[PDB]
Design a binder for this molecule. Structure first.
Ligand SMILES: Cn1cc(Cc2cccs2)c(-c2cc(Cl)nc(N)n2)n1
Ligand SMILES: [Cl-]
Ligand SMILES: [Cl-]
Length: 462
């Protein structure tokens, strides 16, 4: 069976949530369901990202990083997919996975997901990044109600999952230390407590899994097989040994037209074999523009959707003018964030810095006027970042990785309500100093040395 069609290669960059969705053209589109989420990231990774920018790697740092990273990430992806999960998105060394099911099956599927988690940790026992640098992961799990949101224009689509279960899994994963599996309180409340031995987590209602102790007659393989009854797209029969049903997609112009809107043009070029398959693995100077839109705690997903759509329509028009791209969109704790980037796949202009600032101020001014958006915050950082397609052959995404990505991310959270930029952006800009304000230096998680940070005040006093 031939399976290397363009539609199949495109679907590798998307979850089943999208590939097998059958929703309208309206934007925003919103749908609601229940499921279990897994958030996982890798330990000792940014330690490696720094090593690979070193002259040691003789101009093949990006190639070596993507290789070792995909060696480990693809093993996680295989485990998730074998256990029936849907990988929603990748970001650097992290990924979010979904087991969507009806409420009645949540209990049994949580047990499936915990077993998956423990087998993921089993991969990284007796394993190291380097001589003397261990590789481990941290897993948070949550369960409950989940809302999906799709937004975009006629040519581009983006999607998110939203709600307390999403917020819950983010929080659970941040408590997790190396080798931990942390369950949200609602997950613990819904799970088969007859079978999961947990321990308290100080000052928190979330719990840590210690052991899966099933009854004496329990057989996991038979239990799992029964659970697959509720998995619409689990590969089966003649396709028993495929990792994804998406692998079997056949040409369908209408379907491909909708799927390609989720994928960046330079990726599509590679899918069409009009660009070398290694072009996108690179250590590249870029400017990161990390936009955060904050809503109110009581805001419902059905008011949030229209506001993200309106904001997105202006964000994409500004980025088009200033020649930037949306690399990722995320949401948790009532904040929807856009990871925008200037200067990757051939999108290199000399005034990159002035255009990133002016573009940021434009996005700020417009989004501050959108009805339900309570606060806008934008962090701008410039420097060398890793770019590449991360994941497994059958499920992967283009992603950017680096200190400057993390810095822009922390700037928009620690300096809310304004536009901030780093020292590289400030000095390199073709703008005078009174357009800026030098800021207080705040200690920020995961950023050892900020360097001087500035607010982009604007051209006027007012
Ligand atoms: C790798 N990655 C990281 C994130 C942030 C989150 C991590 C835990 C909850 S959210 C996402 C994501 C994906 C989708 Cl589809 N929706 C939303 N809200 N976040 N993916
Ligand atoms: Cl098809
Ligand atoms: Cl870096």
């Amino acid at each position: 069976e031939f399976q290397d069609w363009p539609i199949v290669r495109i679907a590798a960059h998307l979850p089943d949530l999208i590939v097998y969705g059958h929703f309208s053209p309206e934007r925003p589109f919103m749908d609601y369901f229940d499921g279990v989420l897994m958030f996982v990231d890798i330990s000792g990774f940014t330690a490696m990202t720094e090593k690979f920018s070193s002259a040691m790697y003789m101009d093949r740092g990006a190639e070596q990083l993507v290789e070792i990273l995909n060696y480990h990430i693809s093993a996680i992806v295989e485990k998730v997919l074998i256990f029936g999960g849907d990988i929603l998105k990748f970001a650097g060394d992290a990924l979010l996975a979904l087991w969507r099911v009806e409420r009645k099956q949540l209990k049994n599927i949580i047990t499936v997901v915990i077993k998956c988690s423990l087998e993921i940790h089993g991969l990284f026992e007796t394993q190291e990044w380097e001589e003397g640098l261990d590789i481990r992961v941290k897993i948070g799990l949550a369960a409950g109600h989940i809302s999906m949101l799709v937004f975009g224009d006629e040519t581009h689509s983006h999607f998110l999952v939203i709600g307390q279960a999403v917020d819950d899994v983010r929080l659970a994963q941040n408590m997790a230390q190396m080798n931990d599996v942390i369950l949200s309180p609602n997950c613990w409340q819904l799970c088969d407590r007859s079978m999961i031995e947990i321990e308290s987590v100080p000052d928190q209602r979330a719990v840590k899994v210690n052991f899966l102790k099933p009854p004496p007659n329990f057989n996991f393989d038979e239990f799992f097989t029964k659970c697959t009854t509720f998995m619409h797209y689990y590969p089966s029969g003649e396709h028993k040994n495929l990792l994804r049903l998406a692998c079997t997609l056949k040409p369908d112009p209408e379907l491909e037209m909708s799927l390609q809107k989720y994928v960046m043009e330079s990726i599509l070029k590679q899918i069409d074999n009009k660009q070398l398959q290694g072009y996108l693995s690179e250590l590249r100077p870029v400017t990161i523009v990390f936009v955060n839109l904050m809503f109110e705690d009581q805001d419902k997903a059905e008011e949030i959707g229209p506001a993200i759509q309106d904001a997105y329509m202006h964000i994409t028009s500004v980025l088009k003018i200033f020649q930037g791209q949306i690399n990722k969109v995320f949401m948790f704790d009532k904040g929807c964030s856009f990871l925008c980037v200037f200067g990757f796949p051939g999108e290199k202009v000399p005034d990159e810095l002035t255009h990133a600032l002016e573009c940021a101020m434009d996005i700020f001014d417009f989004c501050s006027q959108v009805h339900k958006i309570q606060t806008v915050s934008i962090g701008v950082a410039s420097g060398i970042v890793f770019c590449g397609i991360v994941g497994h052959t059958v499920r992967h995404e283009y992603t950017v990785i680096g200190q400057k990505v993390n810095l822009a991310a922390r700037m928009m959270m620690y300096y809310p309500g304004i536009v901030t930029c780093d020292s590289v952006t400030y000095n390199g800009s073709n703008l005078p100093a009174y357009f800026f304000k030098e800021l207080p230096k705040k200690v920020m998680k995961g950023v050892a040395d900020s360097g001087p940070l500035y607010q982009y005040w604007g051209r006027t006093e007012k």
